[PDB]
PDB file of C-alpha atoms in Angstrom:
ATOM      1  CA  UNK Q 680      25.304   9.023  18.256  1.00  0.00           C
ATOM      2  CA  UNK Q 681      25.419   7.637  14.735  1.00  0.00           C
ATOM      3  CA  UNK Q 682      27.540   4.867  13.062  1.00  0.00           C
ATOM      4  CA  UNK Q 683      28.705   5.283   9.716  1.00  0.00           C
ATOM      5  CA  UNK Q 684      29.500   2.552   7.049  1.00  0.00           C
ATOM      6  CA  UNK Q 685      31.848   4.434   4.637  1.00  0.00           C
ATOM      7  CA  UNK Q 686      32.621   2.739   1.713  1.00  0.00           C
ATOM      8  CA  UNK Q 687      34.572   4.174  -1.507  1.00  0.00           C
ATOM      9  CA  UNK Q 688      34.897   3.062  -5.216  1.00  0.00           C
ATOM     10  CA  UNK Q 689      35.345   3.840  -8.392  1.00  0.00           C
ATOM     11  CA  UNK Q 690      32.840   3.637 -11.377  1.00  0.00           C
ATOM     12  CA  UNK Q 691      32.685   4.233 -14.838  1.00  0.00           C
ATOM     13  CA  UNK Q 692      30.083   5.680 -17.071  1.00  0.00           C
ATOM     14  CA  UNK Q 693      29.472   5.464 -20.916  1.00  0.00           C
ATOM     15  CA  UNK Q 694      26.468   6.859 -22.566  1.00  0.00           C
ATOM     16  CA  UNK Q 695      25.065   7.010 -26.399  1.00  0.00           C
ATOM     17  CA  UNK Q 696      25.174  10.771 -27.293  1.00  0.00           C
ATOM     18  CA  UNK Q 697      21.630  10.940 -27.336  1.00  0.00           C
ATOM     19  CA  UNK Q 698      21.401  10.302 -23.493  1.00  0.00           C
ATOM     20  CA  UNK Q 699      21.735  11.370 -20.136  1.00  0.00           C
ATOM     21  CA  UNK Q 700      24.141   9.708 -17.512  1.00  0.00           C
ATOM     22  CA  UNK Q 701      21.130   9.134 -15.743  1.00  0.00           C
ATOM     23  CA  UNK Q 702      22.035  11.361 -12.579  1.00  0.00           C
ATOM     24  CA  UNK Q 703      21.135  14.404 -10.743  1.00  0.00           C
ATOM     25  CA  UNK Q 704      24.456  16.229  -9.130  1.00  0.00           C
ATOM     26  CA  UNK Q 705      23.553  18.115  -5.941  1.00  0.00           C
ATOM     27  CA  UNK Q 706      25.710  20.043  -4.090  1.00  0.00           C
ATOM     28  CA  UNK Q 707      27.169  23.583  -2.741  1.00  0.00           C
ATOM     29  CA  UNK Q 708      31.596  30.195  -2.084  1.00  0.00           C
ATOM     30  CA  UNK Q 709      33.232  29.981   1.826  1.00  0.00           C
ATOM     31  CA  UNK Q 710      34.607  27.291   4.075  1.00  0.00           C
ATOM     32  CA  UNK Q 711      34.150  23.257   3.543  1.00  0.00           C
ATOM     33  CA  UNK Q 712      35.947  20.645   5.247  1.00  0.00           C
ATOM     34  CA  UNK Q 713      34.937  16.539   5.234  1.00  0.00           C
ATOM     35  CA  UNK Q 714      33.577  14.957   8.002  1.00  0.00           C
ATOM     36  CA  UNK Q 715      32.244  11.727   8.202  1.00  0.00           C
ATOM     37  CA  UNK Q 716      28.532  12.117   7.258  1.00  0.00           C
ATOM     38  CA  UNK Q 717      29.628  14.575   4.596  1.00  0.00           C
ATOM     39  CA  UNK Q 718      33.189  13.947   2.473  1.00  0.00           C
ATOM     40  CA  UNK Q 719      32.367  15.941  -0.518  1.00  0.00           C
ATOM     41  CA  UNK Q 720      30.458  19.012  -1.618  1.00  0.00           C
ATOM     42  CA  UNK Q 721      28.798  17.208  -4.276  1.00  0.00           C
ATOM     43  CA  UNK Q 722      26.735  13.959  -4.410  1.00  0.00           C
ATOM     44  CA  UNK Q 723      24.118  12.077  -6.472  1.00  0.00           C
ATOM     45  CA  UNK Q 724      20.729  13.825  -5.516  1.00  0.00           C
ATOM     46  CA  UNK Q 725      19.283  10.728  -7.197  1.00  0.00           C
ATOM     47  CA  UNK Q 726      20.103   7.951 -10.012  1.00  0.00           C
ATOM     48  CA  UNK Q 727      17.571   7.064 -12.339  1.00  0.00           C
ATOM     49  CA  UNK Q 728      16.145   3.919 -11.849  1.00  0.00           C
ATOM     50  CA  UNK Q 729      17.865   2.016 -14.999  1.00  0.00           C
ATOM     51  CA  UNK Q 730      20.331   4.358 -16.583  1.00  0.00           C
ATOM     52  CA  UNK Q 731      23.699   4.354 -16.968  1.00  0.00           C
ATOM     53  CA  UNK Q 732      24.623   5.658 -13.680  1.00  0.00           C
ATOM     54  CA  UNK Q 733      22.088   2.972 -12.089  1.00  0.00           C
ATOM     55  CA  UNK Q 734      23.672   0.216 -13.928  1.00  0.00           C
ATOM     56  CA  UNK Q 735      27.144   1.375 -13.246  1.00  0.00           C
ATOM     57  CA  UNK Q 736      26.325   1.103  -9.779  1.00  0.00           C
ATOM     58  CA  UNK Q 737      26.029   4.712  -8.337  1.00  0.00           C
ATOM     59  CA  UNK Q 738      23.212   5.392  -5.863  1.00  0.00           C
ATOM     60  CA  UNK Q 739      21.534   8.088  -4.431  1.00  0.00           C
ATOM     61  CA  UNK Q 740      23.656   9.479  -1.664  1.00  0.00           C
ATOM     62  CA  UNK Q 741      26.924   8.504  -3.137  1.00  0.00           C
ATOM     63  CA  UNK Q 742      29.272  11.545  -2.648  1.00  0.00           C
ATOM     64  CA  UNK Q 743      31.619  12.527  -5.695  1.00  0.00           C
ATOM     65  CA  UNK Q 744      35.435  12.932  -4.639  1.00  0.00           C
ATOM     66  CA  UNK Q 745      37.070  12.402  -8.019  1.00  0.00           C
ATOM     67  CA  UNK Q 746      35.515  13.688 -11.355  1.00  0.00           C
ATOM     68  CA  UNK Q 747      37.606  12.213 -14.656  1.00  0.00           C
ATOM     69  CA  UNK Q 748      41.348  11.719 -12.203  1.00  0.00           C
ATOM     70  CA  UNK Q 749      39.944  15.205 -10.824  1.00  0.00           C
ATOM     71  CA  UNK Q 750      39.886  15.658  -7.162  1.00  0.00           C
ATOM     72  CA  UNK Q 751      36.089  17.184  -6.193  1.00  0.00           C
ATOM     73  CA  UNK Q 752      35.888  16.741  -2.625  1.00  0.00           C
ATOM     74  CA  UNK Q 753      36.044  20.524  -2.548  1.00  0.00           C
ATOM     75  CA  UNK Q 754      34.882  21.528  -6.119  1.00  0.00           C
ATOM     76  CA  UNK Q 755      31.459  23.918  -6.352  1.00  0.00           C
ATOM     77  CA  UNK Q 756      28.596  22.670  -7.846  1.00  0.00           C
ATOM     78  CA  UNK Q 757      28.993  24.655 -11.631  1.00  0.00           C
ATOM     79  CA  UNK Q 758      32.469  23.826 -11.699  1.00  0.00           C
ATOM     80  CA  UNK Q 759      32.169  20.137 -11.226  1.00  0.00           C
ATOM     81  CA  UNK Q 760      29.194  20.026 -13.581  1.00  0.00           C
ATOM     82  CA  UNK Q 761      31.776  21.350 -16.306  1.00  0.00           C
ATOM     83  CA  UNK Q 762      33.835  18.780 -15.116  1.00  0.00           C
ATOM     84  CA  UNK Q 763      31.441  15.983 -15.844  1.00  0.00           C
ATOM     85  CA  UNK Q 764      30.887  17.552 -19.383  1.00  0.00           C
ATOM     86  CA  UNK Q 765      34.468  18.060 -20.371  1.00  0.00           C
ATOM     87  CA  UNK Q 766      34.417  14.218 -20.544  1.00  0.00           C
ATOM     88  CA  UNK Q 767      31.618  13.558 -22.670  1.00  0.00           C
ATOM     89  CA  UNK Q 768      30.032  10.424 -22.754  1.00  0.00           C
ATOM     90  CA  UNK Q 769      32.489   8.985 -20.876  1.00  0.00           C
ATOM     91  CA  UNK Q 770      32.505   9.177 -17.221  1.00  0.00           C
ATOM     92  CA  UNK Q 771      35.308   8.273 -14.472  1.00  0.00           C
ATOM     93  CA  UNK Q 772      34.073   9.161 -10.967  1.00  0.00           C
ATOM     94  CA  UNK Q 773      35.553   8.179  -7.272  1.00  0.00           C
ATOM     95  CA  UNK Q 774      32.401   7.744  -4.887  1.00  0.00           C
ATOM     96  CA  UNK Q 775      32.034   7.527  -1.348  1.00  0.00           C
ATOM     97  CA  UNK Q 776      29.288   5.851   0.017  1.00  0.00           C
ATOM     98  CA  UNK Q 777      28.125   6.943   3.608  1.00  0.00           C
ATOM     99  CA  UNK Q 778      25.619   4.890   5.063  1.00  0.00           C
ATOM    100  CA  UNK Q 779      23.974   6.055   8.364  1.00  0.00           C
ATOM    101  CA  UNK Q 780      22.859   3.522  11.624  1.00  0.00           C
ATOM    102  CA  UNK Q 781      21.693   4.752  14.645  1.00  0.00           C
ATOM    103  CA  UNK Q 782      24.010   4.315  17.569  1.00  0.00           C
TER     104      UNK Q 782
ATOM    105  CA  UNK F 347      22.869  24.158  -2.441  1.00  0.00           C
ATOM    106  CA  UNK F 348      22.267  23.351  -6.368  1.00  0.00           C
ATOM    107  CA  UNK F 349      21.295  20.615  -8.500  1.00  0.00           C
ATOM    108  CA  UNK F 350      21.359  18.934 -11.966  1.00  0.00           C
ATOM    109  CA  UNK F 351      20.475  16.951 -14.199  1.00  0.00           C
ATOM    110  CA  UNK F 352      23.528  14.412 -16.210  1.00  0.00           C
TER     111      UNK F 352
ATOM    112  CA  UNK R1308      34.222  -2.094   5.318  1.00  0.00           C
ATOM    113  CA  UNK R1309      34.732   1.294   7.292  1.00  0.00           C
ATOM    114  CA  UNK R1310      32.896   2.266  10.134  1.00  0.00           C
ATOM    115  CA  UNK R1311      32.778   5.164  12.211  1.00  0.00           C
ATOM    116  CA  UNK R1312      31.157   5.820  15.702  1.00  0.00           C
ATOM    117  CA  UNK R1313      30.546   9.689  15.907  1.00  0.00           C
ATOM    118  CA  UNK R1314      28.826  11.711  18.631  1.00  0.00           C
ATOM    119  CA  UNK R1315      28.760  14.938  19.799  1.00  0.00           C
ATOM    120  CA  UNK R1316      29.206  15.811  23.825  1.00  0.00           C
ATOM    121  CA  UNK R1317      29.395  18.349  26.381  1.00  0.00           C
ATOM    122  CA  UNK R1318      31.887  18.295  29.110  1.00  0.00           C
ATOM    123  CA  UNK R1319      31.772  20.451  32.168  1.00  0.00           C
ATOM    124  CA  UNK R1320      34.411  20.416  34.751  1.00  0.00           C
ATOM    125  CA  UNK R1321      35.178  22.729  37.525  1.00  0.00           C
ATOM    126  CA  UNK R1322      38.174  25.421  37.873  1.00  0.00           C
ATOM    127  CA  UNK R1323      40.380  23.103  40.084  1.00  0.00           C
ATOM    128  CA  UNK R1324      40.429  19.870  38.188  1.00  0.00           C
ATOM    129  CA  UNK R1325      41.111  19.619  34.251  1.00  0.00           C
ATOM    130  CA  UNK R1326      38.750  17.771  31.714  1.00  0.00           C
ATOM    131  CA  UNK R1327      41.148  14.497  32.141  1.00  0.00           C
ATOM    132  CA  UNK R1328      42.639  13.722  28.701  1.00  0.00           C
ATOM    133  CA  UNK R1329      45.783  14.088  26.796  1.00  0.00           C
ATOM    134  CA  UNK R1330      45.555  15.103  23.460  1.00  0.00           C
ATOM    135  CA  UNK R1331      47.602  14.244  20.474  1.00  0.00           C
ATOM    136  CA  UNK R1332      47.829  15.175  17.191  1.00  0.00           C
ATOM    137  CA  UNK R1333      50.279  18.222  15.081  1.00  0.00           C
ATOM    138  CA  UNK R1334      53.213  18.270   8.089  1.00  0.00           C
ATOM    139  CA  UNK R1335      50.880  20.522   6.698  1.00  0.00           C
ATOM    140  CA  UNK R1336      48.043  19.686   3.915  1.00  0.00           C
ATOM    141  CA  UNK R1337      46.339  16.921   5.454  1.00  0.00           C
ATOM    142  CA  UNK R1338      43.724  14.824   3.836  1.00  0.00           C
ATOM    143  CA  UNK R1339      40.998  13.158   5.953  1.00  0.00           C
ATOM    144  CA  UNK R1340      41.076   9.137   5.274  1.00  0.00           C
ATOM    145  CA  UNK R1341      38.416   7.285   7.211  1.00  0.00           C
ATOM    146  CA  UNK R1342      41.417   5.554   9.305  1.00  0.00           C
ATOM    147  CA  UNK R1343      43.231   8.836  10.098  1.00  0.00           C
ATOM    148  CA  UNK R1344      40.026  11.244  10.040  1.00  0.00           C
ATOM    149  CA  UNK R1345      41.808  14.390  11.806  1.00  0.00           C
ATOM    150  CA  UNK R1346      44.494  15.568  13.643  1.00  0.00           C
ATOM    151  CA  UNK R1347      44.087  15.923  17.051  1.00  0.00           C
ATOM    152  CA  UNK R1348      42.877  12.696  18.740  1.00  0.00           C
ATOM    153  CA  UNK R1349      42.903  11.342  22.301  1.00  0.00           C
ATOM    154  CA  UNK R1350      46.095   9.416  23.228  1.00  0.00           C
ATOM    155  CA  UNK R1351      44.490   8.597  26.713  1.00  0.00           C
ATOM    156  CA  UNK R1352      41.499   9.566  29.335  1.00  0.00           C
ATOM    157  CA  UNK R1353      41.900   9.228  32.741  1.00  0.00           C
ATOM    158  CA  UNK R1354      39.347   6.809  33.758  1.00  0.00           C
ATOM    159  CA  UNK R1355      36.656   8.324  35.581  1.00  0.00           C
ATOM    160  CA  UNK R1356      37.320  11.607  34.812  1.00  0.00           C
ATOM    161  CA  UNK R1357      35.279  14.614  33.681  1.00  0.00           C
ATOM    162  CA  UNK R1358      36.065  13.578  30.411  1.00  0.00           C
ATOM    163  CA  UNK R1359      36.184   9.638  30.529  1.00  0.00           C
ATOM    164  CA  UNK R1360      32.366  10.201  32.589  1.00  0.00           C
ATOM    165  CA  UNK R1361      30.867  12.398  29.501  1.00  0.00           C
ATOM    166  CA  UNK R1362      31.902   9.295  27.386  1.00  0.00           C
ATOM    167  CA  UNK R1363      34.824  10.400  25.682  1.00  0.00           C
ATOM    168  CA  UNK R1364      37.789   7.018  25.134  1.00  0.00           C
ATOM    169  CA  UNK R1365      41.254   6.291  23.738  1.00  0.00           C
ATOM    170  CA  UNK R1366      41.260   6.847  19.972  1.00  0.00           C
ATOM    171  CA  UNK R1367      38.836   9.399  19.902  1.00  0.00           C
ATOM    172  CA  UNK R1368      39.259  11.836  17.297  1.00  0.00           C
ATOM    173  CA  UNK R1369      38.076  15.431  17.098  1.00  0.00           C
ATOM    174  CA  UNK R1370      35.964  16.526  15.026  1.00  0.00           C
ATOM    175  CA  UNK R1371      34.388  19.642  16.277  1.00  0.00           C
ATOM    176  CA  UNK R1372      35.418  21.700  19.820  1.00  0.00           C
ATOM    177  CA  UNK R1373      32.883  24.176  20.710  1.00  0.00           C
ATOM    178  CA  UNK R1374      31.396  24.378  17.191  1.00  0.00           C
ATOM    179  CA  UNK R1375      34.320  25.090  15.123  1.00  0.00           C
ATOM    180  CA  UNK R1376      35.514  22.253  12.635  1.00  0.00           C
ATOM    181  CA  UNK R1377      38.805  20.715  13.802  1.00  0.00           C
ATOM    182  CA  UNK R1378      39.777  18.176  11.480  1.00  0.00           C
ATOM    183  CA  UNK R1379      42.149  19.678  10.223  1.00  0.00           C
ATOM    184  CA  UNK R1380      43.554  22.296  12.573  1.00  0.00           C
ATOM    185  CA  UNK R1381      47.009  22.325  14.426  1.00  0.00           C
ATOM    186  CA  UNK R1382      47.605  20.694  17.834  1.00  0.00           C
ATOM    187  CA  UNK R1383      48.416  24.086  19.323  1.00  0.00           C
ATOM    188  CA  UNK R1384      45.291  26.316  17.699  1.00  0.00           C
ATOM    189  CA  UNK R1385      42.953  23.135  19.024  1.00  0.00           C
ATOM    190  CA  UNK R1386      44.123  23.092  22.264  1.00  0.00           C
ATOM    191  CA  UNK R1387      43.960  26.984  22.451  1.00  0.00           C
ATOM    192  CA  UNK R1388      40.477  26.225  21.721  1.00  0.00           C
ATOM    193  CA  UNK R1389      39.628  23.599  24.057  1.00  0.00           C
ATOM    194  CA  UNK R1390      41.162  26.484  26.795  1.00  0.00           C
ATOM    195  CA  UNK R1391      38.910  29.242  25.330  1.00  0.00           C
ATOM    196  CA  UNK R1392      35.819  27.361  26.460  1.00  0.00           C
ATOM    197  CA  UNK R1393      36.867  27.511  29.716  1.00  0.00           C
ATOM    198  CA  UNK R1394      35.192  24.870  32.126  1.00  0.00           C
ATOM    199  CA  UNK R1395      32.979  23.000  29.009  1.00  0.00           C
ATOM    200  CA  UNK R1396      33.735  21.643  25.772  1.00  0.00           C
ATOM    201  CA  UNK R1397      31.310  20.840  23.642  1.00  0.00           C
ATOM    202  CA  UNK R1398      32.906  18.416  21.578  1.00  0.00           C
ATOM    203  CA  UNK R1399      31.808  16.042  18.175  1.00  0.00           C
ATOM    204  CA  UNK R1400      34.295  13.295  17.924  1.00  0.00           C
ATOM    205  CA  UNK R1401      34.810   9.773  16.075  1.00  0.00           C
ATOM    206  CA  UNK R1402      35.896   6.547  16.681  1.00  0.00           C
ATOM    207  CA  UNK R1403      36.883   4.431  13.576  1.00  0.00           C
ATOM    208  CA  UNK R1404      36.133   0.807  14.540  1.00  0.00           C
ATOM    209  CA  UNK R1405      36.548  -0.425  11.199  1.00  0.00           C
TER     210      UNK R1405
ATOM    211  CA  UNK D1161      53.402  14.910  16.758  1.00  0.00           C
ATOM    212  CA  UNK D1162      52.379  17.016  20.187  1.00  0.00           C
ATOM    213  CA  UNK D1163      50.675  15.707  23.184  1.00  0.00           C
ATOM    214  CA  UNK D1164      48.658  17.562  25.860  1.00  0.00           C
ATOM    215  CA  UNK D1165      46.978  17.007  29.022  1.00  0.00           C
ATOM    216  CA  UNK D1166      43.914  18.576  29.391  1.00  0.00           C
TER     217      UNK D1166
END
């Protein structure tokens, strides 16, 4: 089997208005419920490698479960994105980090 | 499944 | 600080005897925590059972029967599931050991 | 809760 290290937290993100987050969103219309490898629909594809999202502490992997006090976990991909940009510059997410060890 | 840039 | 043994296995018993667990489990929206992952979990395995042999303990909790996502499905529909398979269950379950 | 021997 697999063990998991789950670990949660909360970040948040500020950016100049000439700049990017630093982050690429990937994610999934039918049925989604969390297991343990995956909690969320969405999660950081990758984090640039000294951005704002890098130096806020997100990683690659990190799932999203709460977008500005908004609850994700279930969210679509364009919807969250609209999320994200509804806040502007500013950025409040929840983030679950699942880390996989063989078993 | 989708992706992003932010 | 939260970890969680998953694995996925296949039980086979035969028409006489039962797969040897009890299971527990039911509010209504439910939100999977990495403490209380689903709803239906194993309350106790008779040791050396079909189902304690295949590797299946105490505490287990059930992620998938046969397939079909279970976290968070009612006691009743789960076990009518676990009887639909008939002599095997193919079953994905976790163990938080946090 | 609901318990049930299987």
């Amino acid at each position: 089997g697999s063990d998991y290290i789950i670990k949660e937290k909360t970040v948040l993100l500020q950016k100049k208005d000439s700049e990017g987050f630093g982050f690429v969103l990937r994610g999934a219309i039918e049925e989604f419920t969390p297991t343990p490898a995956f909690p969320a629909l969405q999660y950081l594809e990758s984090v640039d490698e000294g951005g704002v999202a890098w130096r806020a502490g997100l990683r690659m992997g990190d799932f999203l479960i709460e977008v500005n006090g908004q609850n994700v976990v279930k969210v679509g991909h364009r919807q969250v994105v609209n999320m994200i940009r509804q806040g502007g510059n500013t950025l409040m997410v929840k983030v679950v980090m699942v880390t996989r060890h063989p078993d | 499944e989708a992706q992003t840039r932010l």
